[PDB]
Amino acid sequence: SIVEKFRSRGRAQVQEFCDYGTKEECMKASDADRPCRKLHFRRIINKHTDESLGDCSFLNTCFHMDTCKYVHYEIDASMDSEAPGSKDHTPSQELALTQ
Ligand SMILES: [Zn+2]
Ligand SMILES: [Zn+2]
């Protein structure tokens, strides 16, 4: 695990790539048991399910949440700049779920 020695000094010149620096090859290794630092985007995926089941379409709005069958592809990474005011966020100051 020498690549860890590079994450230990924190050299800025190392923030220009991961272990090797491949476009499609490292991607396959981004979320697999392949070398690399394993620290690349952690996204959850499921086997190709028949989309006739529900639909979700997370691409924008999930509509009904009760669905969320196996179709879903989301990435987890630090928080971005995040727009100010976040008006694109529905209100929910109440702790209890409205119903
Ligand atoms: Zn990598
Ligand atoms: Zn969903």
UniProtKB/Swiss-Prot annotation:
Upregulating conditions: Overexpressed in a number of cancer tissues, such as lung adenocarcinoma and colon adenocarcinoma.
UniProt-annotated location(s): Nucleus; Nucleus speckle; Cytoplasm
Residues where Phosphoserine is found: S92
Positions carrying Phosphothreonine: T90
Protein role: The METTL3-METTL14 heterodimer forms a N6-methyltransferase complex that methylates adenosine residues at the N(6) position of some RNAs and regulates various processes such as the circadian clock, differentiation of embryonic and hematopoietic stem cells, cortical neurogenesis, response to DNA damage, differentiation of T-cells and primary miRNA processing. In the heterodimer formed with METTL14, METTL3 constitutes the catalytic core.
Family: Belongs to the MT-A70-like family.
Protein name: N(6)-adenosine-methyltransferase catalytic subunit METTL3
Species this chain originates from: Homo sapiens
Residue span relative to the full protein: 259 to 357 of 580
